[PDB]
Amino acid sequence: SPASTTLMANAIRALAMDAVQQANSGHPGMPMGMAEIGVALWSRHLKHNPTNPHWADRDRFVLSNGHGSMLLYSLLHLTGYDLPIEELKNFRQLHSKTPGHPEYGITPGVETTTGPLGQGLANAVGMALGEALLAAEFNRDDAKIVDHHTYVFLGDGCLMEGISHEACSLAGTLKLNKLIALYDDNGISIDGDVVNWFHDDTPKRFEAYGWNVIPNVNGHDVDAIDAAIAKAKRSDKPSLICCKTRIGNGAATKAGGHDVHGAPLGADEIAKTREALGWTWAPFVIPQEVYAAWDAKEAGKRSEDDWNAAFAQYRAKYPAEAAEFERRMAGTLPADWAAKAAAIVAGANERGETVATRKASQQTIEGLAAVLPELLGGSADLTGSNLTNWKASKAVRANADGPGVQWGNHINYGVREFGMSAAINGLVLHGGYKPFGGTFLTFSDYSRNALRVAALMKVPSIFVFTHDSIGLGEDGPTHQSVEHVASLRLIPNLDVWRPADTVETAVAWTYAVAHQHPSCLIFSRQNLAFNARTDAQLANVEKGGYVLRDWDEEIVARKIILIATGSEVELAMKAVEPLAQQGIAARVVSMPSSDVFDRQDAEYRERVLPHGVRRVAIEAGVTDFWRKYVGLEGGVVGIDTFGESAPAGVLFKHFGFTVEHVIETAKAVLA
Amino acid sequence: ASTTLMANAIRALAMDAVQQANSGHPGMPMGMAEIGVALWSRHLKHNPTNPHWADRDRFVLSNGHGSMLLYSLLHLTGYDLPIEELKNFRQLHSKTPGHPEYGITPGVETTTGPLGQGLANAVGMALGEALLAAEFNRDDAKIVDHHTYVFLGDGCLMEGISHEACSLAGTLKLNKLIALYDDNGISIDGDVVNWFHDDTPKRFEAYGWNVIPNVNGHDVDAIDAAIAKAKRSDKPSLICCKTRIGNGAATKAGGHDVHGAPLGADEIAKTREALGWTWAPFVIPQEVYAAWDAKEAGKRSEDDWNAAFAQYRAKYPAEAAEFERRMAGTLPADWAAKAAAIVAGANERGETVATRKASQQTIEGLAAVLPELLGGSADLTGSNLTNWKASKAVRANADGPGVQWGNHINYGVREFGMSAAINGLVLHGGYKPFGGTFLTFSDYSRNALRVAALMKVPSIFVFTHDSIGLGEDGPTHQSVEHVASLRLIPNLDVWRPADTVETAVAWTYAVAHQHPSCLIFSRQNLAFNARTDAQLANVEKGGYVLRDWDEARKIILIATGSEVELAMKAVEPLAQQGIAARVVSMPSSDVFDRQDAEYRERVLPHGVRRVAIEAGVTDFWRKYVGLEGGVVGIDTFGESAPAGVLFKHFGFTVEHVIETAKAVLA
Ligand SMILES: Cc1ncc(C[n+]2csc(CCOP(=O)(O)OP(=O)(O)O)c2C)c(N)n1
Ligand SMILES: Cc1ncc(C[n+]2csc(CCOP(=O)(O)OP(=O)(O)O)c2C)c(N)n1
Ligand SMILES: O=P(O)(O)OC[C@H]1O[C@@H](O)[C@H](O)[C@@H]1O
Ligand SMILES: O=P(O)(O)OC[C@H]1O[C@@H](O)[C@H](O)[C@@H]1O
Ligand SMILES: [Br-]
Ligand SMILES: [Br-]
Ligand SMILES: [Br-]
Ligand SMILES: [Br-]
Ligand SMILES: [Ca+2]
Ligand SMILES: [Ca+2]
């Protein structure tokens, strides 16, 4: 007898309930509820190769309800990915390939890192947009190389989160019809029956976004779910399949209950569940016929083999394009990257312009685009204000007459910071593009956890933020960042650049673009003075903090270091001659990135900030951050309150960003 | 004077004030001028003379960039906002900042500017009115009855927070909330249809809202009729007002340039001509003042309510005194002693429990003395431990509009909408609200925490699961940078208590403090610490000496929350190595920073070196330990493993404390 769908689904049940029991921790409800959905999608529709999780044209799957991780670990194991049974035995254990929520980079087949509800859905919107752009860009009438679907499992949690609204409204407007969402519709969240706090007509909601909805599907009928996916694959709109399930389905006593979401079933309940399901095998034992029914290694090999032959036929007709496709899918920059980056930094230096760093950024974007065809910019409805767009770009737009998008390389995201940012994580994960997205610095508070997840996954998302201080002027304290620059530096693995002029901007951008981890690039509204640099100083900008103005040789005056960033570098420099007329010799250290500076070696950090010489930090943001560089004995010229609505000039004088206050602070520090 | 003249007065003030400041947003106020007339002039119940009248309708400007609209309305209808202040739009110390600010201007109910949050505040205000009515009203005497109006645009509707707020408001059947949508087809990048093609009426019906689609947004009578229909509604209402951004402008109306830039003098002169507005900038003729002014109607309205309240007091003296107490945000009478008893109880019990359980234990005690206490959780009630045995769940009525009364709210998975709704509840008066979620997901709600801090209102945000100590859920949940990142927000108190006693102090301080608070609790059990009565009295100073030097080489160990235990366990082993350790517990560094210099010097004397110990990023501690001190923390994301395994793996051990201390004293 070969395996029935019931036996295939019950294997998921058994692995889930057993792994959770073993760890005494985790979530058996969702995996047990979603088991028939897993069979229908994975065994009948998903195009993938377990032997090569990196195959360019694989379907992308995302588990947005990430707490149900054992569902993904079961499917991966059963269908033949390199995730052995011993790894499932070590669910939720230190250094296992089975962490409590799935982690990209940790486990083969895991496309993104989930756990924070709602972000998977948005990642998946990004992945579908990437497929759609990459298809419009690379496919030719006589040779197709891009064609895959994007699948996402999600629950009540993701649908309640505001980010689902941002993502799905945008996906509906852009007609991303190869995105197919399967909703685990089980009527229950952690607090109990969802109807008491979440009574949406969800089908009607998604129709309003311009999605196709298949409501009221029996989530325990494989054939019905299978049929719903097949209809979805014929749809001219993104689809939502509402799969009515019972949470913890199959459990003897606890199914549909308020206690199966996120605690182990208990040994008795498992024993009773085994008998109720007729599942006779011991924990982590899977019978041969169950592996044989699930295993995807043969079909995965045929699929990738046909694709490789298709790509070979495409290379013969389109060799330059085929090589571009490979390079870009790998996330590799051009072979002559070092030359091309240097041309961009050098042009910034030749021009010697005094402009706002948001304008510097746009000038640098212009130069990047000319050599990076993968460049993909965008803004959360602040295009003309962030200056994220370039003259030769083309805006992404839905096709007027059918599904999908016309190719473009700049995206209007709408007023959707968080959705934009998690979409960018998706775009970066998909491969083929180098994406970035802008908003005002303070509204990093809206997209924050997406910046964090990018930093956790270690993918090189680029987040542009403009209007970075009181320097923005009249829009006032709701808009003026104070705490943000420092608060972003706190996130592990997230580089923060706050350049002082065109040259630092070109370095920040070129560095960010080549770096493996994500970056925040922070620009001013207001014009900042250009700084002339020697060759030695130019070479040191990329070290994050460097000596911009040194003391003269063999001097006699009392020494101070001024450490400044961004718009405050200008203030530090205007303070040098005045400090000298006061008997104080001021070195100016510019620190466009403290994160990068901290990675420099000890000899170099000691050369920039010599022990025993006192320091004043200068930055239009909270002061406490600076104590790591200035100590208890040092000073800081900064801002520890919210701002005020007035012109920038007025605000800078009001808040003590003046030569006089710098002098006074330096004198206090030297006393 | 005609309604056209009334509307154009808003146009003139808005375009002229933006020109004078050479800065601001004339588009929206010009586009919404008739909507302003219909609501403010024909439906809004309010007394310009007393902005704090308890039973006033609440108005929220969610599309806060259109601030000149509100300043105009406030000025025309007779609030204490003189023409001189409109002349000083966007200037230092004016009562007319670029986005409206609660506390700065009379009649400004909340601070907006961050899109979407106004809408969520209004959901909170309407929930406040509804709960208070169900609680205080009686069959023979009504004292609570008012509507909540919110102006909003495309930005607010795109923001995910609008989904959170409106989905919750629909399920709770808050039928007195009335939202007027400035439906103008434009956002900053241009034609919204290219990035925002939602059928918004259909979306809102899906939430359980009543929708009045396709209203002519320049026809006062039609908008008026829609507002009237909405006041008759079973459900919250969205009135979709079709408008032209910059409407009335001579040549630029409906353009992509009127959102956020001055019209220019040329355009203004021509607009004066096309409108037939003959008066010079900031000059309003007396007939327009006479048509707009609401002083007399406002006085009759509040006088009628004042009488109904007196009729209520004669029948319900005790309930009436409670109403006045709570609307004013005043604590109960023997408050100092009741709070002292709650602390003393935690001290007497001496239990070792998680601070999440401590928190629940304190909530039990707070609830017994604060009938105004209003808890809730973002779908983590049994995990945050935000409810208490006697609490009752807020629920929609089964059969009609509105809610049954309750004092714990299930917010669903909506950290940001919950938090901004809590701000609204606080601003409304009548309750002492709080809401919980996991600490890391403060990232979702972050900007609402910030706005509570800007408005200086005492919102309470509960966060549990505060570090690697949460264990198996792993690095997406395990907070690392959060504690320090919340300390950086100005005016936001952050408490991270070590045990039941610190928890009791943190909670009682938060309840009586004017600024908002983050209360941060552990998932795992934390050891109880015995305190002298003098140590007890210093807990509310935010940092204090928990274990003093024995009257060997001196060090100070500064520790917070769950790490106080590791600091205390290190004292004896450090003694065996010739180091005399003082332990300073710092449950709130923010509160500590506010103490006077003598006290701070007493706790942290100059010249004694310091090691900080906290399960979070290490750099923050340099403000206290200096370049020469040490930190025992975590500067990477965590891992998925049991808590005990994590603490060992990440160096939270006595050995590491000793080693750091010796490095520091070298
Ligand atoms: C942003 C965020 N907030 C809160 C949580 C904690 N949490 C995890 S699952 C969940 C409930 C969502 O339940 P649902 O998605 O309906 O999953 P089911 O229990 O039905 O599997 C919550 C509140 C989280 N993981 N992420
Ligand atoms: C959270 C947030 N993100 C971004 C912005 C910047 N911003 C202000 S108004 C606006 C456009 C909103 O357009 P709409 O609400 O339709 O305004 P209209 O110009 O039509 O009044 C944007 C993107 C903001 N104020 N708040
Ligand atoms: O002049 P910038 O700062 O680019 O824009 C100023 C204002 O104009 C609008 O675009 C934005 O809403 C912002 O508030
Ligand atoms: O066991 P605690 O930490 O209370 O919470 C249980 C966990 O499992 C679920 O209930 C929650 O999502 C949380 O992740
Ligand atoms: Br067996
Ligand atoms: Br060009
Ligand atoms: Br457009
Ligand atoms: Br000593
Ligand atoms: Ca559910
Ligand atoms: Ca608009």
mmCIF file of C-alpha atoms in Angstrom, chain A residues 23-27 91-96 98-103 113-119 156-166 169-170 173-174 189-192 194-202 204-205 207-209 379-385 396-398 410-418 442-443 445-449 452-453 455-457 474-484 486-487 490-493 598 615 622 624-625 627-633 640-647 650-651 654, chain B residues 21-25 90-94 96-101 111-117 154-164 167-168 171-172 187-190 192-203 205-207 377-383 394-396 408-416 440-441 443-447 450-451 453-454 472-482 484-485 488-491 593 610 617 619-620 622-628 635-642 645-646 649:
data_model
loop_
_atom_site.group_PDB
_atom_site.id
_atom_site.type_symbol
_atom_site.label_atom_id
_atom_site.label_comp_id
_atom_site.label_asym_id
_atom_site.label_seq_id
_atom_site.Cartn_x
_atom_site.Cartn_y
_atom_site.Cartn_z
ATOM 1 C CA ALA A 23 12.087 20.227 23.568
ATOM 2 C CA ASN A 24 9.296 20.841 26.106
ATOM 3 C CA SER A 25 8.727 24.043 24.157
ATOM 4 C CA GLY A 26 7.129 25.190 20.905
ATOM 5 C CA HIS A 27 3.880 25.314 18.940
ATOM 6 C CA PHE A 91 14.295 21.387 17.978
ATOM 7 C CA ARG A 92 14.929 24.597 19.969
ATOM 8 C CA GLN A 93 18.383 23.502 21.103
ATOM 9 C CA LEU A 94 21.570 25.546 20.939
ATOM 10 C CA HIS A 95 23.263 25.322 17.484
ATOM 11 C CA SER A 96 20.567 23.039 15.956
ATOM 12 C CA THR A 98 15.852 23.743 13.938
ATOM 13 C CA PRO A 99 15.524 27.010 15.916
ATOM 14 C CA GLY A 100 12.070 27.809 17.418
ATOM 15 C CA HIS A 101 11.324 30.263 14.590
ATOM 16 C CA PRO A 102 12.864 29.627 11.154
ATOM 17 C CA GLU A 103 16.090 31.480 10.381
ATOM 18 C CA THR A 113 13.496 34.666 8.935
ATOM 19 C CA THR A 114 10.016 34.863 10.515
ATOM 20 C CA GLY A 115 8.581 34.973 14.068
ATOM 21 C CA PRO A 116 7.608 38.642 14.067
ATOM 22 C CA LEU A 117 4.032 38.352 12.700
ATOM 23 C CA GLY A 118 3.219 39.975 9.390
ATOM 24 C CA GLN A 119 6.762 40.376 8.058
ATOM 25 C CA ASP A 156 -4.854 35.447 12.108
ATOM 26 C CA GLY A 157 -1.813 37.135 13.677
ATOM 27 C CA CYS A 158 -0.307 38.260 10.353
ATOM 28 C CA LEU A 159 -3.724 39.459 9.122
ATOM 29 C CA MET A 160 -4.315 41.602 12.223
ATOM 30 C CA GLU A 161 -0.844 43.256 11.959
ATOM 31 C CA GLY A 162 -0.987 46.589 10.105
ATOM 32 C CA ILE A 163 1.895 45.473 7.901
ATOM 33 C CA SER A 164 -0.399 42.972 6.147
ATOM 34 C CA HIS A 165 -2.468 45.997 5.033
ATOM 35 C CA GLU A 166 0.585 47.814 3.692
ATOM 36 C CA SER A 169 -2.749 46.802 -0.695
ATOM 37 C CA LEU A 170 0.499 47.374 -2.558
ATOM 38 C CA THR A 173 -2.277 47.647 -6.848
ATOM 39 C CA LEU A 174 0.757 46.219 -8.626
ATOM 40 C CA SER A 189 -5.459 33.430 18.501
ATOM 41 C CA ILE A 190 -3.556 33.424 21.775
ATOM 42 C CA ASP A 191 -6.260 35.190 23.818
ATOM 43 C CA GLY A 192 -9.006 32.790 22.577
ATOM 44 C CA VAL A 194 -10.595 35.763 17.513
ATOM 45 C CA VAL A 195 -14.115 36.915 16.755
ATOM 46 C CA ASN A 196 -14.093 38.973 19.986
ATOM 47 C CA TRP A 197 -11.324 41.303 18.724
ATOM 48 C CA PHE A 198 -11.017 40.526 14.977
ATOM 49 C CA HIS A 199 -14.330 40.179 13.105
ATOM 50 C CA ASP A 200 -13.167 41.230 9.622
ATOM 51 C CA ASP A 201 -14.857 39.857 6.541
ATOM 52 C CA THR A 202 -11.391 38.948 5.296
ATOM 53 C CA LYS A 204 -14.224 41.275 1.286
ATOM 54 C CA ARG A 205 -11.068 43.041 2.657
ATOM 55 C CA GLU A 207 -11.178 41.923 -2.761
ATOM 56 C CA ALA A 208 -10.959 45.627 -1.893
ATOM 57 C CA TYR A 209 -7.190 45.441 -2.323
ATOM 58 C CA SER A 379 10.478 55.880 -1.512
ATOM 59 C CA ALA A 380 7.520 55.691 0.831
ATOM 60 C CA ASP A 381 5.736 58.676 -0.845
ATOM 61 C CA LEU A 382 8.775 60.965 -0.321
ATOM 62 C CA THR A 383 10.512 60.515 -3.680
ATOM 63 C CA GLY A 384 10.965 64.223 -4.382
ATOM 64 C CA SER A 385 11.897 64.901 -0.788
ATOM 65 C CA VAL A 396 7.493 50.588 -11.859
ATOM 66 C CA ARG A 397 3.795 50.529 -12.817
ATOM 67 C CA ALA A 398 1.099 47.860 -13.023
ATOM 68 C CA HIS A 410 12.288 53.077 -9.093
ATOM 69 C CA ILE A 411 9.258 52.234 -6.941
ATOM 70 C CA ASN A 412 6.612 54.514 -5.401
ATOM 71 C CA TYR A 413 5.801 52.486 -2.259
ATOM 72 C CA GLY A 414 3.058 54.750 -0.924
ATOM 73 C CA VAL A 415 2.982 55.751 2.736
ATOM 74 C CA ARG A 416 4.132 52.304 3.845
ATOM 75 C CA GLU A 417 7.496 52.428 5.660
ATOM 76 C CA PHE A 418 7.273 49.039 7.352
ATOM 77 C CA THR A 442 12.091 59.603 12.499
ATOM 78 C CA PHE A 443 9.757 57.234 10.582
ATOM 79 C CA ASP A 445 10.265 54.082 14.087
ATOM 80 C CA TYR A 446 7.505 52.755 11.792
ATOM 81 C CA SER A 447 9.750 50.267 9.898
ATOM 82 C CA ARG A 448 12.066 49.440 12.806
ATOM 83 C CA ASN A 449 11.656 45.703 13.240
ATOM 84 C CA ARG A 452 16.274 44.585 12.737
ATOM 85 C CA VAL A 453 15.300 41.430 10.793
ATOM 86 C CA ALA A 455 20.368 42.866 10.418
ATOM 87 C CA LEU A 456 19.553 39.470 11.912
ATOM 88 C CA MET A 457 19.510 37.685 8.502
ATOM 89 C CA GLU A 474 9.617 74.081 10.586
ATOM 90 C CA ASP A 475 7.838 70.655 10.528
ATOM 91 C CA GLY A 476 8.839 70.449 14.199
ATOM 92 C CA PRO A 477 9.293 67.825 16.926
ATOM 93 C CA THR A 478 7.089 65.030 15.483
ATOM 94 C CA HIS A 479 9.467 64.995 12.513
ATOM 95 C CA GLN A 480 12.838 66.081 13.922
ATOM 96 C CA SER A 481 14.911 63.068 14.993
ATOM 97 C CA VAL A 482 16.748 63.258 18.228
ATOM 98 C CA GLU A 483 17.236 59.703 19.459
ATOM 99 C CA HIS A 484 17.156 57.881 16.086
ATOM 100 C CA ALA A 486 21.913 56.532 18.207
ATOM 101 C CA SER A 487 19.022 54.060 18.455
ATOM 102 C CA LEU A 490 22.317 49.897 18.855
ATOM 103 C CA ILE A 491 20.950 47.219 16.512
ATOM 104 C CA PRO A 492 23.634 44.476 16.020
ATOM 105 C CA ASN A 493 24.994 44.164 12.447
ATOM 106 C CA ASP A 598 34.524 50.120 15.862
ATOM 107 C CA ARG A 615 37.338 64.846 23.653
ATOM 108 C CA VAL A 622 21.044 62.498 22.176
ATOM 109 C CA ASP A 624 24.654 59.740 26.082
ATOM 110 C CA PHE A 625 25.762 57.633 23.109
ATOM 111 C CA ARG A 627 30.192 58.596 26.423
ATOM 112 C CA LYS A 628 31.678 55.507 24.805
ATOM 113 C CA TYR A 629 34.211 57.828 23.073
ATOM 114 C CA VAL A 630 34.450 60.885 25.410
ATOM 115 C CA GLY A 631 34.165 59.145 28.843
ATOM 116 C CA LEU A 632 32.850 60.675 32.061
ATOM 117 C CA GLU A 633 35.408 63.440 31.793
ATOM 118 C CA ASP A 640 18.417 65.604 24.830
ATOM 119 C CA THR A 641 14.910 67.078 24.440
ATOM 120 C CA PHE A 642 12.448 67.006 21.547
ATOM 121 C CA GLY A 643 12.808 69.906 19.048
ATOM 122 C CA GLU A 644 10.577 72.887 18.185
ATOM 123 C CA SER A 645 8.800 74.183 15.121
ATOM 124 C CA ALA A 646 10.968 77.072 13.768
ATOM 125 C CA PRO A 647 13.461 77.615 10.865
ATOM 126 C CA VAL A 650 16.802 79.633 14.601
ATOM 127 C CA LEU A 651 16.767 76.095 16.016
ATOM 128 C CA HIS A 654 18.284 78.022 20.205
ATOM 129 C CA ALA B 21 6.074 81.380 7.208
ATOM 130 C CA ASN B 22 7.309 80.540 3.680
ATOM 131 C CA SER B 23 6.624 76.996 4.820
ATOM 132 C CA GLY B 24 3.777 74.549 5.317
ATOM 133 C CA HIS B 25 0.885 72.768 3.689
ATOM 134 C CA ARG B 90 5.893 77.771 12.277
ATOM 135 C CA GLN B 91 7.972 80.249 14.391
ATOM 136 C CA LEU B 92 9.813 79.521 17.654
ATOM 137 C CA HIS B 93 7.450 79.488 20.699
ATOM 138 C CA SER B 94 4.326 80.236 18.696
ATOM 139 C CA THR B 96 0.901 77.485 15.891
ATOM 140 C CA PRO B 97 3.633 74.860 15.282
ATOM 141 C CA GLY B 98 3.823 73.201 11.844
ATOM 142 C CA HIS B 99 1.933 70.123 13.117
ATOM 143 C CA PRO B 100 -0.557 70.491 15.961
ATOM 144 C CA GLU B 101 0.744 69.809 19.467
ATOM 145 C CA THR B 111 -0.310 65.659 18.710
ATOM 146 C CA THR B 112 -0.315 64.690 15.051
ATOM 147 C CA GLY B 113 2.125 64.801 12.161
ATOM 148 C CA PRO B 114 2.976 61.083 12.177
ATOM 149 C CA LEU B 115 0.376 59.778 9.745
ATOM 150 C CA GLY B 116 -2.199 57.263 10.912
ATOM 151 C CA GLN B 117 -1.698 57.807 14.638
ATOM 152 C CA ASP B 154 -4.701 59.046 1.800
ATOM 153 C CA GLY B 155 -1.540 58.878 3.959
ATOM 154 C CA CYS B 156 -3.396 57.730 7.066
ATOM 155 C CA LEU B 157 -5.340 55.141 5.021
ATOM 156 C CA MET B 158 -2.159 53.703 3.488
ATOM 157 C CA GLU B 159 -0.482 53.354 6.892
ATOM 158 C CA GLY B 160 -0.862 49.900 8.452
ATOM 159 C CA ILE B 161 -1.922 51.481 11.726
ATOM 160 C CA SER B 162 -5.257 52.438 10.054
ATOM 161 C CA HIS B 163 -5.996 48.710 9.537
ATOM 162 C CA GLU B 164 -5.221 47.963 13.194
ATOM 163 C CA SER B 167 -10.471 46.747 12.343
ATOM 164 C CA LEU B 168 -10.609 46.912 16.159
ATOM 165 C CA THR B 171 -15.351 44.692 15.927
ATOM 166 C CA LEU B 172 -16.045 46.786 19.022
ATOM 167 C CA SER B 187 -0.323 62.112 -2.274
ATOM 168 C CA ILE B 188 3.219 63.489 -2.304
ATOM 169 C CA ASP B 189 4.567 61.392 -5.250
ATOM 170 C CA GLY B 190 1.465 62.355 -7.301
ATOM 171 C CA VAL B 192 -2.296 57.873 -5.606
ATOM 172 C CA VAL B 193 -3.987 55.431 -7.913
ATOM 173 C CA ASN B 194 -0.520 54.269 -9.096
ATOM 174 C CA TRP B 195 0.365 52.931 -5.616
ATOM 175 C CA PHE B 196 -2.941 52.917 -3.769
ATOM 176 C CA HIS B 197 -5.921 51.616 -5.761
ATOM 177 C CA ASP B 198 -7.955 50.231 -2.805
ATOM 178 C CA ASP B 199 -11.714 50.284 -2.970
ATOM 179 C CA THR B 200 -11.736 51.990 0.425
ATOM 180 C CA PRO B 201 -15.515 51.772 1.020
ATOM 181 C CA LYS B 202 -15.386 48.010 0.472
ATOM 182 C CA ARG B 203 -12.373 47.781 2.839
ATOM 183 C CA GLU B 205 -17.452 47.629 5.184
ATOM 184 C CA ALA B 206 -15.284 44.548 5.621
ATOM 185 C CA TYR B 207 -14.264 46.020 9.030
ATOM 186 C CA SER B 377 -2.680 43.052 25.936
ATOM 187 C CA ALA B 378 -1.866 42.718 22.224
ATOM 188 C CA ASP B 379 -3.047 39.096 22.121
ATOM 189 C CA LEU B 380 -0.669 38.073 24.936
ATOM 190 C CA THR B 381 -2.917 38.292 27.987
ATOM 191 C CA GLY B 382 -1.882 34.969 29.557
ATOM 192 C CA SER B 383 1.729 35.504 28.600
ATOM 193 C CA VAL B 394 -14.456 44.495 27.273
ATOM 194 C CA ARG B 395 -16.810 43.051 24.596
ATOM 195 C CA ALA B 396 -19.038 44.517 21.913
ATOM 196 C CA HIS B 408 -9.284 44.599 30.394
ATOM 197 C CA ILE B 409 -9.063 44.877 26.616
ATOM 198 C CA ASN B 410 -7.994 42.165 24.151
ATOM 199 C CA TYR B 411 -6.364 44.320 21.522
ATOM 200 C CA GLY B 412 -5.449 41.474 19.150
ATOM 201 C CA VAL B 413 -2.062 41.402 17.392
ATOM 202 C CA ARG B 414 -1.889 45.176 17.035
ATOM 203 C CA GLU B 415 1.014 46.632 19.072
ATOM 204 C CA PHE B 416 1.015 49.981 17.252
ATOM 205 C CA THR B 440 11.098 43.315 21.120
ATOM 206 C CA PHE B 441 7.748 44.176 19.550
ATOM 207 C CA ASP B 443 9.674 48.025 17.569
ATOM 208 C CA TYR B 444 6.206 47.715 16.050
ATOM 209 C CA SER B 445 4.674 50.353 18.342
ATOM 210 C CA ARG B 446 7.734 52.568 18.722
ATOM 211 C CA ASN B 447 6.492 55.866 17.351
ATOM 212 C CA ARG B 450 7.546 58.450 21.287
ATOM 213 C CA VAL B 451 4.396 60.548 20.832
ATOM 214 C CA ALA B 453 6.654 61.067 25.497
ATOM 215 C CA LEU B 454 6.294 64.215 23.328
ATOM 216 C CA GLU B 472 13.623 28.798 23.177
ATOM 217 C CA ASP B 473 11.677 31.328 21.086
ATOM 218 C CA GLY B 474 15.092 32.636 19.971
ATOM 219 C CA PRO B 475 16.656 35.773 18.390
ATOM 220 C CA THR B 476 13.558 37.201 16.635
ATOM 221 C CA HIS B 477 11.905 37.496 20.056
ATOM 222 C CA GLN B 478 14.947 37.920 22.321
ATOM 223 C CA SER B 479 15.412 41.559 23.056
ATOM 224 C CA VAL B 480 18.986 42.856 22.947
ATOM 225 C CA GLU B 481 18.969 46.574 22.082
ATOM 226 C CA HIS B 482 15.444 47.481 23.295
ATOM 227 C CA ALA B 484 18.708 51.005 25.927
ATOM 228 C CA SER B 485 16.835 52.144 22.837
ATOM 229 C CA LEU B 488 17.061 57.192 24.584
ATOM 230 C CA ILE B 489 13.541 58.547 23.947
ATOM 231 C CA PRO B 490 13.258 61.852 25.907
ATOM 232 C CA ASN B 491 10.667 61.872 28.735
ATOM 233 C CA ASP B 593 19.384 60.762 36.308
ATOM 234 C CA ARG B 610 32.414 50.357 37.979
ATOM 235 C CA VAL B 617 23.856 46.009 24.541
ATOM 236 C CA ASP B 619 27.632 50.659 25.067
ATOM 237 C CA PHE B 620 24.785 52.375 26.960
ATOM 238 C CA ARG B 622 29.584 53.883 29.304
ATOM 239 C CA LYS B 623 27.651 56.927 30.622
ATOM 240 C CA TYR B 624 28.162 55.446 34.141
ATOM 241 C CA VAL B 625 31.250 53.231 33.860
ATOM 242 C CA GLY B 626 33.364 55.546 31.674
ATOM 243 C CA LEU B 627 36.143 54.454 29.327
ATOM 244 C CA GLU B 628 37.946 52.803 32.262
ATOM 245 C CA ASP B 635 26.150 42.870 21.734
ATOM 246 C CA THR B 636 24.929 40.180 19.305
ATOM 247 C CA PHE B 637 21.485 38.722 18.636
ATOM 248 C CA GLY B 638 20.641 35.674 20.756
ATOM 249 C CA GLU B 639 20.010 31.998 19.934
ATOM 250 C CA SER B 640 17.207 29.443 20.232
ATOM 251 C CA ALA B 641 17.925 27.400 23.387
ATOM 252 C CA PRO B 642 16.727 27.072 27.017
ATOM 253 C CA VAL B 645 22.003 27.392 28.400
ATOM 254 C CA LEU B 646 21.916 30.947 26.973
ATOM 255 C CA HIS B 649 26.846 30.590 26.578
#
